Amino acid sequence: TDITEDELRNFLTQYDVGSLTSYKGIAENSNFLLHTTKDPLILTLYEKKNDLPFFLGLMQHLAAKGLSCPLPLPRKDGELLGELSGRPAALISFLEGMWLRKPEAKHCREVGKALAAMHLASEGFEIKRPNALSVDGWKVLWDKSEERADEVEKGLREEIRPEIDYLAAHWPKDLPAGVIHADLFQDNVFFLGDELSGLIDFYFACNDLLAYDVSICLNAWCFEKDGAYNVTKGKALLEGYQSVRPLSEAELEALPLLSRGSALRFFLTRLYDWLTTPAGALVVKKDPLEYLRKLRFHRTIANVAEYGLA
Amino acid sequence: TDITEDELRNFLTQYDVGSLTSYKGIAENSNFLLHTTKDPLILTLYEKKNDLPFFLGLMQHLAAKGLSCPLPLPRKDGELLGELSGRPAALISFLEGMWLRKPEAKHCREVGKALAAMHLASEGFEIKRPNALSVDGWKVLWDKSEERADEVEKGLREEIRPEIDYLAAHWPKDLPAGVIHADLFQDNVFFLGDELSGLIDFYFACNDLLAYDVSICLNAWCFEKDGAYNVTKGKALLEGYQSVRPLSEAELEALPLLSRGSALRFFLTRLYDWLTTPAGALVVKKDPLEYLRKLRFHRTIANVAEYGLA
Ligand SMILES: [Mg+2]
Numbered sequence: 001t002d003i004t005e006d007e008l009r010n011f012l013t014q015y016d017v018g019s020l021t022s023y024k025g026i027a028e029n030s031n032f033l034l035h036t037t038k039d040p041l042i043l044t045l046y047e048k049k050n051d052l053p054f055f056l057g058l059m060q061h062l063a064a065k066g067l068s069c070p071l072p073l074p075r076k077d078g079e080l081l082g083e084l085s086g087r088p089a090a091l092i093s094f095l096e097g098m099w100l101r102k103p104e105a106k107h108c109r110e111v112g113k114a115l116a117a118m119h120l121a122s123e124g125f126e127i128k129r130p131n132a133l134s135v136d137g138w139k140v141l142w143d144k145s146e147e148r149a150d151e152v153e154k155g156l157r158e159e160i161r162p163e164i165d166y167l168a169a170h171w172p173k174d175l176p177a178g179v180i181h182a183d184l185f186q187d188n189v190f191f192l193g194d195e196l197s198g199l200i201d202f203y204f205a206c207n208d209l210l211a212y213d214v215s216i217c218l219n220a221w222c223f224e225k226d227g228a229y230n231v232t233k234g235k236a237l238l239e240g241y242q243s244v245r246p247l248s249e250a251e252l253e254a255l256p257l258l259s260r261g262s263a264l265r266f267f268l269t270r271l272y273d274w275l276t277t278p279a280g281a282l283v284v285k286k287d288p289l290e291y292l293r294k295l296r297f298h299r300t301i302a303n304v305a306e307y308g309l310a
Numbered sequence: 311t312d313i314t315e316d317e318l319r320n321f322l323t324q325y326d327v328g329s330l331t332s333y334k335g336i337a338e339n340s341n342f343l344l345h346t347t348k349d350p351l352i353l354t355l356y357e358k359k360n361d362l363p364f365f366l367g368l369m370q371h372l373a374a375k376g377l378s379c380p381l382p383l384p385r386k387d388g389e390l391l392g393e394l395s396g397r398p399a400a401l402i403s404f405l406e407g408m409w410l411r412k413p414e415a416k417h418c419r420e421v422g423k424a425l426a427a428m429h430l431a432s433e434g435f436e437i438k439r440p441n442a443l444s445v446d447g448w449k450v451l452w453d454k455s456e457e458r459a460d461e462v463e464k465g466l467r468e469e470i471r472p473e474i475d476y477l478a479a480h481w482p483k484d485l486p487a488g489v490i491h492a493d494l495f496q497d498n499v500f501f502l503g504d505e506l507s508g509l510i511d512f513y514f515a516c517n518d519l520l521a522y523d524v525s526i527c528l529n530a531w532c533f534e535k536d537g538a539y540n541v542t543k544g545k546a547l548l549e550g551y552q553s554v555r556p557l558s559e560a561e562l563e564a565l566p567l568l569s570r571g572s573a574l575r576f577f578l579t580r581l582y583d584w585l586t587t588p589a590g591a592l593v594v595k596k597d598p599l600e601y602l603r604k605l606r607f608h609r610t611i612a613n614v615a616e617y618g619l620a
């Protein structure tokens with residue numbers, strides 16, 4: 001999606017920011033980096049009904065409490081959103097830093113500290129949004145993919161069915177819950193040098209188990225590109241998180257099961273995208289088997305010490 | 311193509327610029343918008359042997375003479391280029407402004423003034439680069455596309471052959487020549503408001519007829535999206551150009567033929583790209599017939615007055 005010069009200039013009169021000097025499309029949503037006579041900005045077109053108030057309101061709340069995350073800029077007319085070339089649109093503050101292509105264990109510690117800080121900061125935010133991608137959503141995604149799963153790997157259907165049944169039967173209820181990011185991968189965390197400078201992209205955020213968000217980050221940050229679990233990174237992540245918000249015995253004990261769950265979650269969306277991408281295109285599509293391999297690894301874990309924490 | 315944080319930081323120690331605070335992939339070549347503690351910058355990875363010295367050297371020369379175009383930043387080691395993740399790489403100054411999605415005739419006048427200023431400023435630059443996409447290149451492109459041209463439109467082969475033969479037989483020799491941009495479309499010109507703020511992307515630049523560069527801009531700026539020639543824009547463009555560098559009688563007289571030539575040039579690259587893009591992909595490909603239609607229109611022109619200049 002593109003925007004014209006006059007439309008964007010009109011859009012910016014709804015906000016109190018510099019005058020436009022530059023705008024560039026940058027690498028769901030369309031995003032533009034704006035330069036102005038004041039500060040740079042991010043423009044987001046939502047390529048898209050109470051979810052945006054949740055996401056943008058959460059971002060405000062967290063920023064108001066000191067978290068380094070992007071702040072939605074306020075509109076003159078008091079509305080939450082504008083509109084640009086058909087789509088809902090928001091101006092958002094610009095955070096410095098870059099996401100790490102080759103994170104090291106010391107960075108994972110910063111990530112754990114920041115995730116805990118985010119969990120603590122999210123207290124008092126009262127708009128609710130259930131996780132659309134927990135157990136019930138896994139069942140929907142699987143149901144839609146089940147008959148063609150064996151195209152990805154022979155035996156895949158019979159491997160997954162018992163596991164989804166099991167996770168659903170045992171999914172924990174009585175663990176600390178709050179607002180979680182639910183998608184905190186490498187590309188959603190900024191650093192300036194080795195200091196973490198921000199958390200971005202809260203569009204999967206929702207109310208769910210805090211230790212489930214930890215399990216997403218274990219899956220996201222603590223495995224090597226060849227699939228090897230990296231205990232040095234797992235230790236860093238978990239100790240970093242504990243340094244800010246200690247995990248209970250019940251939370252630590254649940255991590256292997258929760259990590260199977262989050263691994264399955266990414267397996268399932270990747271599987272659905274893989275089966276559903278048109279026959280013969282040149283998007284190279286994410287391999288769902290990466291997350292099946294992570295899921296199997298988590299089944300081997302008898303104690304959180306094995307993730308690196310003890 | 312992507313770059314890692316450490317590679318880019320090392321790359322920037324070869325230059326005298328701020329420290330890196332941010333980098334973003336932006337919408338041949340891969341381009342990144344860098345923020346630093348000093349000025350913003352553009353990083354270009356050439357997705358690629360004397361052409362870069364020509365292009366980057368031209369950019370330097372023009373900037374040194376006042377033209378608003380991007381300046382290649384100088385390397386500590388005196389070399390012209392660096393290397394990043396396999397590719398040749400250059401840091402380039404950042405120009406403010408945005409390219410016009412909906413240019414009006416008054417903007418076309420600014421474009422004409424700037425093209426003339428560029429032609430005048432390019433005097434004294436002595437590296438030579440022949441146009442690879444003049445008559446000889448048209449013959450190569452056509453030869454490679456000729457047998458499948460009728461797939462785009464019935465009769466296309468027999469329409470083009472006489473025209474390419476004719477242009478080749480009559481292509482003008484004795485018109486003013488110098489360095490031309492050779493690709494000055496809407497997306498290669500920046501404005502801040504209604505003031506033109508820069509010319510960018512000189513990677514088709516070459517030594518050729520100055521009025522041939524004017525004919526590219528007539529083709530690029532002076533037709534509506536429905537194909538209609540816009541005499542108001544043509545007048546603006548040509549009068550703007552004349553206000554800085556008057557065109558001779560011989561140049562004005564040649565414009566219809568030159569415009570057939572430049573129209574054919576874009577027809578041919580578009581045709582080759584169209585035939586050569588894999589069967590069943592979802593890049594929507596540029597229609598070569600747009601430029602066949604422009605070519606036919608130029609055949610109807612008996613006098614430059616009809617483009618709008620008189
Ligand atoms: Mg380091």
Ligand SMILES: [Mg+2]
Pocket residue numbers: 504
């Ligand atoms: Mg205006």
